[PDB]
Short mmCIF file of C-alpha atoms (C1' of nucleotides) and ligand atoms in Angstrom, two decimals:
data_model
loop_
_atom_site.label_atom_id
_atom_site.label_comp_id
_atom_site.label_asym_id
_atom_site.label_seq_id
_atom_site.Cartn_x
_atom_site.Cartn_y
_atom_site.Cartn_z
CA UNK A 22 18.40 23.10 52.86
CA UNK A 23 19.98 22.47 56.26
CA UNK A 24 22.10 19.85 58.06
CA UNK A 25 20.20 20.06 61.36
CA UNK A 26 20.01 17.53 64.27
CA UNK A 27 17.07 17.25 66.65
CA UNK A 28 15.88 14.83 69.38
CA UNK A 29 12.56 13.18 69.96
CA UNK A 30 10.78 10.74 72.34
CA UNK A 31 8.71 8.68 69.90
CA UNK A 32 5.76 6.94 71.70
CA UNK A 33 5.94 3.45 70.25
CA UNK A 34 3.33 2.18 72.76
CA UNK A 35 0.68 4.37 71.15
CA UNK A 36 2.07 3.94 67.67
CA UNK A 37 1.56 0.23 68.02
CA UNK A 38 -1.86 -0.89 69.21
CA UNK A 39 -3.98 -4.02 68.41
CA UNK A 40 -0.93 -5.42 66.42
CA UNK A 41 -0.09 -9.10 66.77
CA UNK A 42 2.80 -10.46 68.67
CA UNK A 43 4.97 -12.03 65.88
CA UNK A 44 4.67 -8.80 63.80
CA UNK A 45 5.19 -6.08 66.45
CA UNK A 46 8.94 -5.12 66.58
CA UNK A 47 9.09 -4.93 62.78
CA UNK A 48 6.00 -2.53 62.76
CA UNK A 49 7.96 -0.51 65.40
CA UNK A 50 10.69 0.07 62.87
CA UNK A 51 8.33 0.72 59.93
CA UNK A 52 6.64 3.32 62.03
CA UNK A 53 10.01 4.83 63.12
CA UNK A 54 10.97 5.16 59.49
CA UNK A 55 7.59 6.74 58.64
CA UNK A 56 7.99 9.15 61.62
CA UNK A 57 11.43 10.10 60.43
CA UNK A 58 10.15 10.65 56.88
CA UNK A 59 7.34 12.78 58.21
CA UNK A 60 9.38 14.90 60.48
CA UNK A 61 12.54 15.54 58.66
CA UNK A 62 10.99 15.38 55.16
CA UNK A 63 13.34 13.24 53.29
CA UNK A 64 12.20 9.78 52.12
CA UNK A 65 15.65 8.26 52.74
CA UNK A 66 15.96 6.99 56.33
CA UNK A 67 18.86 5.04 57.75
CA UNK A 68 18.50 3.75 61.32
CA UNK A 69 21.61 2.43 63.21
CA UNK A 70 22.46 -0.92 64.81
CA UNK A 71 22.31 0.67 68.21
CA UNK A 72 18.74 1.60 67.60
CA UNK A 73 18.21 -1.96 66.22
CA UNK A 74 19.37 -3.31 69.48
CA UNK A 75 17.36 -0.83 71.51
CA UNK A 76 14.16 -1.79 69.72
CA UNK A 77 14.88 -5.61 69.57
CA UNK A 78 16.28 -5.66 73.15
CA UNK A 79 13.16 -7.26 74.74
CA UNK A 80 11.99 -9.72 72.13
CA UNK A 81 9.38 -9.39 69.37
CA UNK A 82 6.29 -8.59 71.44
CA UNK A 83 7.59 -6.83 74.55
CA UNK A 84 8.51 -3.68 72.55
CA UNK A 85 9.67 -0.92 74.91
CA UNK A 86 7.02 1.74 75.35
CA UNK A 87 9.14 4.80 74.41
CA UNK A 88 12.58 5.35 72.94
CA UNK A 89 14.65 8.52 72.95
CA UNK A 90 16.05 9.04 69.47
CA UNK A 91 18.26 11.63 67.69
CA UNK A 92 17.56 12.54 64.08
CA UNK A 93 20.41 14.04 62.07
CA UNK A 94 19.94 15.16 58.47
CA UNK A 95 23.05 14.93 56.28
CA UNK A 96 23.80 15.20 52.61
CA UNK A 97 24.72 12.37 50.15
CA UNK A 98 27.61 12.34 47.70
CA UNK A 99 29.45 9.98 45.26
CA UNK A 100 26.94 9.70 42.43
CA UNK A 101 24.10 10.32 44.75
CA UNK A 102 20.40 9.43 44.63
CA UNK A 103 17.67 11.86 43.42
CA UNK A 104 17.10 12.40 47.15
CA UNK A 105 20.34 14.21 48.15
CA UNK A 106 19.46 14.35 51.92
CA UNK A 107 19.05 11.36 54.26
CA UNK A 108 18.05 11.14 57.84
CA UNK A 109 20.39 9.06 60.00
CA UNK A 110 18.46 8.12 63.00
CA UNK A 111 20.68 7.25 65.90
CA UNK A 112 19.80 6.09 69.40
CA UNK A 113 20.69 8.07 72.59
CA UNK A 114 20.10 6.31 75.96
CA UNK A 115 18.54 8.01 78.89
CA UNK A 116 17.35 6.71 82.30
CA UNK A 117 14.12 8.52 82.62
CA UNK A 118 11.56 9.72 80.15
CA UNK A 119 9.54 12.37 82.07
CA UNK A 120 10.01 16.20 81.55
CA UNK A 121 11.95 15.40 78.36
CA UNK A 122 10.94 17.18 75.14
CA UNK A 123 12.32 17.93 71.67
CA UNK A 124 15.72 19.48 71.75
CA UNK A 125 17.69 21.01 68.82
CA UNK A 126 21.23 19.65 69.25
CA UNK A 127 23.96 21.89 68.01
CA UNK B 4 -22.84 11.16 76.93
CA UNK B 5 -25.09 9.49 79.52
CA UNK B 6 -25.59 9.77 83.26
CA UNK B 7 -28.08 8.70 85.87
CA UNK B 8 -30.88 10.68 87.48
CA UNK B 9 -32.16 9.91 90.89
CA UNK B 10 -35.69 11.07 90.32
CA UNK B 11 -38.86 11.36 92.56
CA UNK B 12 -41.81 9.90 90.78
CA UNK B 13 -45.13 11.43 91.33
CA UNK B 14 -47.28 8.86 89.53
CA UNK B 15 -50.09 7.42 91.70
CA UNK B 16 -51.45 3.86 91.61
CA UNK B 17 -48.07 2.04 91.48
CA UNK B 18 -45.29 0.55 93.40
CA UNK B 19 -43.14 3.36 91.79
CA UNK B 20 -44.84 6.14 93.67
CA UNK B 21 -43.28 8.11 96.52
CA UNK B 22 -39.87 6.45 95.96
CA UNK B 23 -36.63 7.53 94.18
CA UNK B 24 -36.00 5.86 90.78
CA UNK B 25 -32.72 5.83 88.93
CA UNK B 26 -33.04 6.12 85.08
CA UNK B 27 -30.59 5.91 82.32
CA UNK B 28 -30.48 9.50 80.86
CA UNK B 29 -28.65 10.86 77.85
CA UNK B 30 -27.12 14.40 77.49
CA UNK B 31 -27.24 16.08 74.08
CA UNK B 32 -25.32 19.31 73.62
CA UNK B 33 -27.30 21.88 71.69
CA UNK B 34 -25.63 25.16 70.69
CA UNK B 35 -27.92 27.85 69.52
CA UNK B 36 -29.18 27.82 65.92
CA UNK B 37 -28.19 30.76 63.66
CA UNK B 38 -30.81 31.58 61.24
CA UNK B 39 -29.74 32.09 57.55
CA UNK B 40 -32.38 31.30 55.03
CA UNK B 41 -36.08 31.19 54.17
CA UNK B 42 -37.57 28.61 51.97
CA UNK B 43 -41.12 28.78 50.54
CA UNK B 44 -43.29 25.88 49.34
CA UNK B 45 -46.12 25.65 46.85
CA UNK B 46 -48.59 22.70 47.14
CA UNK B 47 -48.49 21.08 43.65
CA UNK B 48 -50.82 18.12 42.71
CA UNK B 49 -47.61 16.02 42.65
CA UNK B 50 -46.50 17.21 46.12
CA UNK B 51 -44.48 20.21 47.41
CA UNK B 52 -42.36 22.44 45.28
CA UNK C 28 -34.89 16.86 67.95
CA UNK C 29 -38.27 17.10 66.40
CA UNK C 30 -41.64 18.09 68.20
CA UNK C 31 -44.18 15.19 68.44
CA UNK C 32 -46.62 15.25 65.52
CA UNK C 33 -49.47 13.87 67.78
CA UNK C 34 -50.82 15.03 71.11
CA UNK C 35 -50.87 12.63 74.05
CA UNK C 36 -51.53 12.89 77.71
CA UNK C 37 -51.61 9.20 78.67
CA UNK C 38 -50.18 10.03 82.09
CA UNK C 39 -46.80 9.87 80.38
CA UNK C 40 -46.53 13.58 79.46
CA UNK C 41 -46.96 16.83 81.51
CA UNK C 42 -45.58 15.62 84.79
CA UNK C 43 -43.67 18.21 86.92
CA UNK C 44 -40.47 16.30 87.61
CA UNK C 45 -38.31 16.73 90.67
CA UNK C 46 -34.61 16.09 89.86
CA UNK C 47 -32.66 15.11 92.92
CA UNK C 48 -29.34 13.89 91.99
CA UNK C 49 -27.36 13.71 88.71
CA UNK C 50 -24.14 11.76 89.15
CA UNK C 51 -20.90 12.99 87.40
CA UNK C 52 -18.68 10.05 88.34
CA UNK C 53 -15.73 8.88 86.30
CA UNK C 54 -17.32 7.47 83.13
CA UNK C 55 -13.79 6.62 81.85
CA UNK C 56 -13.82 3.43 83.84
CA UNK C 57 -15.51 2.71 87.24
CA UNK C 58 -16.45 6.16 88.83
CA UNK C 59 -15.61 6.42 92.50
CA UNK C 60 -16.08 10.16 93.22
CA UNK C 61 -18.46 12.99 92.48
CA UNK C 62 -16.46 16.20 92.49
CA UNK C 63 -12.71 17.09 92.42
CA UNK C 64 -13.07 18.74 95.87
CA UNK C 65 -14.70 15.73 97.24
CA UNK C 66 -12.06 13.37 95.84
CA UNK C 67 -9.26 15.56 97.31
CA UNK C 68 -10.96 15.77 100.64
CA UNK C 69 -11.51 11.94 100.79
CA UNK C 70 -7.90 11.01 99.64
CA UNK C 71 -5.77 13.88 100.98
CA UNK C 72 -2.24 14.88 100.12
CA UNK C 73 -0.09 12.93 97.65
CA UNK C 74 3.46 13.34 96.28
CA UNK C 75 2.14 15.98 93.87
CA UNK C 76 1.28 18.16 96.86
"C1'" A D 20 -45.17 22.82 34.49
"C1'" G D 21 -45.40 31.17 33.74
"C1'" G D 22 -43.49 34.99 28.50
"C1'" C D 23 -47.43 36.48 25.20
"C1'" G D 24 -51.32 39.71 25.76
"C1'" G D 25 -53.93 44.84 27.41
"C1'" C D 26 -53.55 50.56 28.94
"C1'" C D 27 -51.12 55.96 28.90
"C1'" G D 28 -47.52 59.24 26.61
"C1'" C D 29 -43.88 59.79 22.51
"C1'" C D 30 -40.98 57.96 18.32
"C1'" C D 31 -39.74 57.89 11.32
"C1'" C D 32 -43.79 57.47 8.27
"C1'" C D 33 -48.78 55.45 6.50
"C1'" U D 34 -54.25 59.30 5.46
"C1'" C D 35 -53.53 52.05 -0.44
"C1'" G D 36 -53.10 48.93 7.33
"C1'" C D 37 -59.36 46.95 3.72
"C1'" C D 38 -64.40 45.81 -0.46
"C1'" C D 39 -66.13 47.40 -6.03
"C1'" G D 40 -64.60 49.61 -11.09
"C1'" U D 41 -60.36 51.47 -15.19
"C1'" C D 42 -55.24 50.72 -17.31
"C1'" A D 43 -50.45 48.38 -18.18
"C1'" C D 44 -46.58 45.36 -16.65
"C1'" G D 45 -43.54 41.76 -14.04
"C1'" C D 46 -40.23 34.54 -17.16
"C1'" A D 47 -45.51 33.90 -20.92
"C1'" C D 48 -39.38 29.24 -18.79
"C1'" C D 49 -43.79 26.76 -24.80
"C1'" G D 50 -48.34 19.27 -21.00
"C1'" C D 51 -46.04 17.46 -16.52
"C1'" A D 52 -43.11 15.18 -9.87
"C1'" C D 53 -40.53 16.43 -4.26
"C1'" G D 54 -44.00 23.69 -5.05
"C1'" U D 55 -45.74 26.71 -1.39
"C1'" U D 56 -45.29 26.49 5.39
"C1'" C D 57 -44.49 28.17 12.42
"C1'" G D 58 -37.40 27.88 9.60
"C1'" U D 59 -33.31 34.22 11.42
"C1'" G D 60 -36.60 24.29 12.09
"C1'" G D 61 -32.82 20.95 17.19
"C1'" G D 62 -28.01 20.50 18.99
"C1'" G D 63 -22.72 19.85 18.25
"C1'" A D 64 -17.14 21.98 16.11
"C1'" A D 65 -14.98 26.29 14.29
"C1'" C D 66 -14.60 31.64 10.99
"C1'" C D 67 -14.24 38.15 11.26
"C1'" U D 68 -16.53 42.09 14.16
"C1'" G D 69 -19.56 45.95 18.32
"C1'" G D 70 -21.25 46.64 23.39
"C1'" C D 71 -21.72 44.81 28.54
"C1'" G D 72 -19.39 41.19 32.21
"C1'" C D 73 -16.94 36.85 34.57
"C1'" U D 74 -11.52 35.53 37.09
"C1'" A D 75 -13.64 29.23 39.72
"C1'" A D 76 -14.78 24.09 41.30
"C1'" A D 77 -14.50 18.95 41.52
"C1'" C D 78 -11.18 14.26 41.60
"C1'" C D 79 -6.48 12.09 43.13
"C1'" A D 80 -2.39 12.66 47.16
"C1'" U D 81 -2.16 13.62 52.90
"C1'" U D 82 -4.91 13.36 57.39
"C1'" C D 83 -9.42 11.72 59.57
"C1'" G D 84 -12.91 7.83 62.43
"C1'" U D 85 -18.67 9.48 63.89
"C1'" A D 86 -17.13 4.85 58.84
"C1'" G D 87 -14.72 1.25 56.83
"C1'" A D 88 -13.95 -6.11 52.87
"C1'" C D 89 -12.25 -2.91 48.50
"C1'" G D 90 -14.67 1.12 46.71
"C1'" A D 91 -17.86 4.61 49.35
"C1'" C D 92 -19.13 8.26 53.92
"C1'" C D 93 -18.14 12.27 57.93
"C1'" U D 94 -13.63 15.46 58.52
"C1'" G D 95 -8.49 19.23 58.99
"C1'" C D 96 -4.78 22.32 56.49
"C1'" U D 97 -3.68 30.26 57.45
"C1'" U D 98 0.93 31.73 58.53
"C1'" C D 99 -2.34 33.05 63.28
"C1'" U D 100 -7.85 31.39 68.43
"C1'" G D 101 -4.34 26.26 62.36
"C1'" G D 102 -3.12 21.18 62.59
"C1'" G D 103 0.76 17.54 64.22
"C1'" U D 104 4.66 15.48 67.57
"C1'" C D 105 6.57 15.37 72.58
"C1'" G D 106 5.85 17.11 77.52
"C1'" G D 107 2.44 18.81 81.47
"C1'" G D 108 -1.82 18.12 84.35
"C1'" G D 109 -7.40 15.86 84.92
"C1'" U D 110 -9.37 10.96 84.67
"C1'" U D 111 -8.68 5.77 85.22
"C1'" U D 112 -6.18 0.45 85.85
"C1'" C D 113 -3.38 -2.54 89.16
"C1'" G D 114 -1.92 -2.49 94.26
"C1'" U D 115 2.48 0.01 97.61
"C1'" A D 116 8.56 0.09 92.82
"C1'" C D 117 14.45 0.04 93.06
"C1'" G D 118 17.45 1.78 96.71
"C1'" U D 119 18.14 3.15 101.89
"C1'" A D 120 17.37 2.45 107.39
"C1'" G D 121 15.26 -0.56 111.43
"C1'" C D 122 16.32 -1.86 119.70
"C1'" A D 123 10.47 -5.85 113.67
"C1'" G D 124 11.64 -10.64 112.22
"C1'" A D 125 11.27 -18.75 112.96
"C1'" G D 126 16.00 -18.99 114.18
"C1'" C D 127 21.43 -20.26 113.17
"C1'" A D 128 26.82 -19.34 113.16
"C1'" G D 129 31.20 -16.52 114.71
"C1'" C D 130 33.93 -12.98 118.17
"C1'" U D 131 35.95 -11.01 123.03
"C1'" C D 132 35.78 -5.19 126.48
"C1'" C D 133 34.54 -11.40 128.42
"C1'" C D 134 30.92 -8.19 126.67
"C1'" U D 135 24.85 -6.20 132.84
"C1'" C D 136 18.56 -6.69 124.46
"C1'" G D 137 27.33 -6.37 123.52
"C1'" C D 138 28.90 -6.75 118.34
"C1'" U D 139 29.23 -8.97 113.38
"C1'" G D 140 27.41 -12.33 109.40
"C1'" C D 141 23.41 -15.46 107.00
"C1'" G D 142 18.26 -15.27 106.95
"C1'" A D 143 11.06 -16.16 103.96
"C1'" U D 144 9.07 -11.97 105.18
"C1'" C D 145 7.46 -6.88 107.67
"C1'" U D 146 7.61 -1.67 108.72
"C1'" A D 147 8.85 3.91 107.10
"C1'" U D 148 10.04 6.61 102.53
"C1'" U D 149 4.80 4.69 99.58
"C1'" G D 150 -3.16 6.04 97.88
"C1'" A D 151 3.93 4.03 95.90
"C1'" A D 152 5.93 2.59 91.02
"C1'" A D 153 4.25 1.59 86.12
"C1'" G D 154 0.43 2.31 81.62
"C1'" U D 155 -3.13 5.91 80.20
"C1'" C D 156 -5.53 6.64 73.22
"C1'" A D 157 -3.45 4.59 69.39
"C1'" G D 158 -11.20 5.28 68.70
"C1'" C D 159 -10.75 9.62 76.52
"C1'" C D 160 -10.64 15.63 78.33
"C1'" C D 161 -7.82 20.52 78.61
"C1'" U D 162 -3.06 22.47 76.84
"C1'" C D 163 -2.30 28.73 73.52
"C1'" G D 164 4.82 24.93 77.63
"C1'" A D 165 9.01 23.03 73.65
"C1'" C D 166 9.97 21.69 68.56
"C1'" A D 167 8.99 21.62 63.65
"C1'" C D 168 5.17 21.96 59.27
"C1'" A D 169 1.67 25.19 56.75
"C1'" A D 170 0.22 28.27 48.67
"C1'" G D 171 3.72 22.05 48.15
"C1'" G D 172 2.00 18.88 44.34
"C1'" G D 173 -0.73 15.62 39.76
"C1'" U D 174 -5.58 14.82 36.63
"C1'" U D 175 -10.08 16.92 34.77
"C1'" U D 176 -14.25 20.31 34.02
"C1'" G D 177 -18.58 25.66 30.23
"C1'" U D 178 -24.37 27.22 28.63
"C1'" C D 179 -27.77 30.40 21.65
"C1'" G E 24 34.43 -50.54 45.35
"C1'" U E 25 36.07 -46.11 47.77
"C1'" A E 26 33.19 -38.58 45.84
"C1'" C E 27 28.35 -36.95 47.44
"C1'" C E 28 22.72 -37.26 49.50
"C1'" C E 29 21.21 -41.12 52.95
"C1'" A E 30 16.66 -36.48 53.19
"C1'" U E 31 10.01 -31.96 55.21
"C1'" A E 32 15.44 -30.57 48.33
"C1'" U E 33 20.32 -35.71 45.56
"C1'" C E 34 15.68 -42.59 46.98
"C1'" C E 35 10.08 -44.18 45.72
"C1'" G E 36 5.38 -42.01 45.02
"C1'" C E 37 4.80 -38.04 37.18
"C1'" A E 38 7.24 -32.89 41.35
"C1'" G E 39 12.33 -29.20 45.83
"C1'" C E 40 4.80 -33.48 47.34
"C1'" A E 41 2.48 -32.53 55.67
"C1'" G E 42 3.17 -39.69 52.64
"C1'" G E 43 6.90 -44.12 52.99
"C1'" U E 44 12.08 -46.45 53.87
"C1'" C E 45 16.91 -49.89 57.81
"C1'" U E 46 20.79 -48.16 61.70
"C1'" C E 47 25.32 -45.96 65.49
"C1'" C E 48 26.58 -41.28 68.75
"C1'" A E 49 24.21 -38.74 72.53
"C1'" A E 50 25.14 -32.83 76.90
"C1'" G E 51 23.05 -29.09 81.35
"C1'" G E 52 18.43 -27.78 84.60
"C1'" U E 53 13.40 -29.08 86.58
"C1'" G E 54 11.93 -33.83 86.71
"C1'" A E 55 10.97 -41.06 88.52
"C1'" A E 56 11.75 -40.75 83.26
"C1'" C E 57 15.30 -41.24 76.16
"C1'" A E 58 8.15 -37.92 79.28
"C1'" G E 59 6.85 -32.36 78.42
"C1'" C E 60 9.38 -27.32 78.82
"C1'" C E 61 13.93 -24.01 78.58
"C1'" U E 62 19.33 -23.69 77.51
"C1'" C E 63 25.04 -25.73 75.35
"C1'" U E 64 27.86 -28.07 70.97
"C1'" G E 65 26.06 -28.16 66.00
"C1'" G E 66 22.48 -26.53 62.19
"C1'" C E 67 18.22 -23.27 60.25
"C1'" A E 68 15.49 -18.96 57.95
"C1'" U E 69 9.50 -20.69 59.30
"C1'" G E 70 9.43 -24.77 54.77
"C1'" U E 71 7.13 -23.42 46.21
"C1'" U E 72 5.73 -15.56 47.88
"C1'" G E 73 6.05 -10.45 50.14
"C1'" G E 74 3.21 -5.62 51.60
"C1'" A E 75 -1.57 -3.00 53.79
"C1'" A E 76 -6.16 -3.20 56.57
"C1'" C E 77 -8.55 -6.69 60.64
"C1'" A E 78 -15.57 -7.22 57.07
"C1'" A E 79 -19.08 -11.73 56.75
"C1'" U E 80 -18.28 -16.96 56.60
"C1'" G E 81 -14.49 -20.54 57.87
"C1'" U E 82 -10.18 -23.48 60.10
"C1'" A E 83 -7.39 -24.22 65.14
"C1'" G E 84 -7.45 -22.12 70.52
"C1'" G E 85 -9.70 -19.67 74.99
"C1'" U E 86 -13.51 -17.76 78.04
"C1'" A E 87 -18.57 -16.40 79.76
"C1'" A E 88 -23.42 -14.09 84.87
"C1'" G E 89 -27.86 -17.89 86.49
"C1'" G E 90 -29.65 -22.99 85.24
"C1'" G E 91 -26.88 -27.62 84.57
"C1'" A E 92 -28.06 -32.27 79.35
"C1'" A E 93 -33.99 -29.08 79.65
"C1'" G E 94 -30.63 -29.58 72.91
"C1'" U E 95 -29.67 -34.08 70.50
"C1'" C E 96 -31.39 -40.80 67.98
"C1'" G E 97 -27.83 -40.88 71.72
"C1'" G E 98 -23.14 -36.28 77.37
"C1'" C E 99 -21.36 -36.01 70.00
"C1'" A E 100 -17.68 -32.41 71.11
"C1'" A E 101 -15.95 -29.90 75.29
"C1'" G E 102 -15.02 -29.74 80.46
"C1'" C E 103 -14.12 -31.82 85.48
MG1 LIG F 15 8.44 -5.01 89.89
MG1 LIG F 16 32.32 -41.46 51.92
MG1 LIG F 17 8.87 -35.43 51.77
MG1 LIG F 18 1.85 -39.32 42.91
MG1 LIG F 19 8.75 -38.61 56.58
MG1 LIG F 20 19.60 -34.15 82.01
MG1 LIG F 21 17.42 -34.82 89.28
MG1 LIG F 22 20.18 -43.30 73.65
MG1 LIG F 23 10.36 -27.87 50.87
MG1 LIG F 24 2.66 -25.15 51.50
MG1 LIG F 25 9.36 -15.41 51.54
MG1 LIG F 26 -22.06 -20.35 82.13
MG1 LIG F 27 -21.37 -19.71 85.41
MG1 LIG F 28 -24.92 -29.58 89.00
MG1 LIG F 29 -32.04 -35.45 85.47
MG1 LIG F 30 -34.27 -39.64 72.13
MG1 LIG F 31 -15.86 -37.58 74.43
MG1 LIG F 32 -13.71 -24.50 82.91
#
RNA sequence: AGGCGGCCGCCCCCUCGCCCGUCACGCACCGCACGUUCGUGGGGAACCUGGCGCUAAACCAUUCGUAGACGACCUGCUUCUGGGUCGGGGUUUCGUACGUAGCAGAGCAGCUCCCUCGCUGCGAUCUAUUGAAAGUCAGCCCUCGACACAAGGGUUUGUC
RNA sequence: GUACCCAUAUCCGCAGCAGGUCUCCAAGGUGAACAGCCUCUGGCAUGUUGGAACAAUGUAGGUAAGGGAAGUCGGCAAGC
């Protein structure tokens, strides 16, 4: 019942293990969609083209080991779905990854 | 898990005696057993009841 | 762990052992050190110190 | 592989709980079968009533990996010592990151204070920062640091 | 006569069939090379299906301490 926005550091290197080379970067995005559905609760997940570039920036098998993401939850209108809420996952770049944790962004 | 033990062997009549022998040794954690029940048995001519 | 249902000496049981060294090396890979104080005394200060 | 039997004291009565003798009746259904029995026989679905009680558990879903072809098996879930995601260390794996500085560097080129290892530029490497950087559980260990979540669902199951 | 395909989808093979069918044009780098590999112009959605897990067996590929043909009809295959 909220419109909140948080940040995460998803660990794609441990959410992908033992997975083949030609089907690695798609499983990254399937796992990002499942992580967004698990955290924010709604089944509708829309990920952006910047996050698409950030995942597919190093080929299909050299998936980057960790990606800082920002999950906003917004409402849907104009003859909406049965799921009125949808998580718009956007990509926020950061130089380092250490000592960074989950932040509720106003 | 498993560890080594460097063990002195006091077993006479061998090459093993008076030397240190390393043996593969397991460790089994055993917390104490809390007693709850008592079950009695009757010797039947078909077995135990 | 069940008690043995038969009794044997066989020079295999009832030997007063003398444990001398039980290694606790790094089993998550190849173990190089025994205790944390010994590892820190061998290596020394790092960036974390 | 047990449930009827025996003893003491009371309870409402029986002194016909039985054998022989007298009397009169009950359907005498007029020739006819499956009649008499342990039967208040076995179990299932319901009908109205008295008394005494009971207030759950499986399966799916999710997670789990000590198991998995699929099924199956071992597991967690609470609003407080709960789990999950990040982060932090512990371990380990490789081998010393980018950047910066150097009167280190085979040498080469240029300049003028005419520079008494003068200065500048190119230049594989090397040294110091550096037992550095990077990964570390997805099937490693501890976290009571930060976020959120927690009874939120569907199907089924009774013994006179 | 003048369109179009000229082909792992417009031809033949019963078919949108790993088969067959005659030609011209040809870039940059490494390289002796129109070799093999990576890019440019120009095309494409992986070749009549997608999703989940990574059991046996299989089909292709790679290793393996010590011995080096002792296996096998034969060094077959693989490797130097
Ligand atoms: Mg590097
Ligand atoms: Mg034409
Ligand atoms: Mg063809
Ligand atoms: Mg044919
Ligand atoms: Mg052909
Ligand atoms: Mg060329
Ligand atoms: Mg050339
Ligand atoms: Mg030519
Ligand atoms: Mg085709
Ligand atoms: Mg095919
Ligand atoms: Mg397809
Ligand atoms: Mg070999
Ligand atoms: Mg060998
Ligand atoms: Mg030889
Ligand atoms: Mg020979
Ligand atoms: Mg022969
Ligand atoms: Mg051959
Ligand atoms: Mg070889």
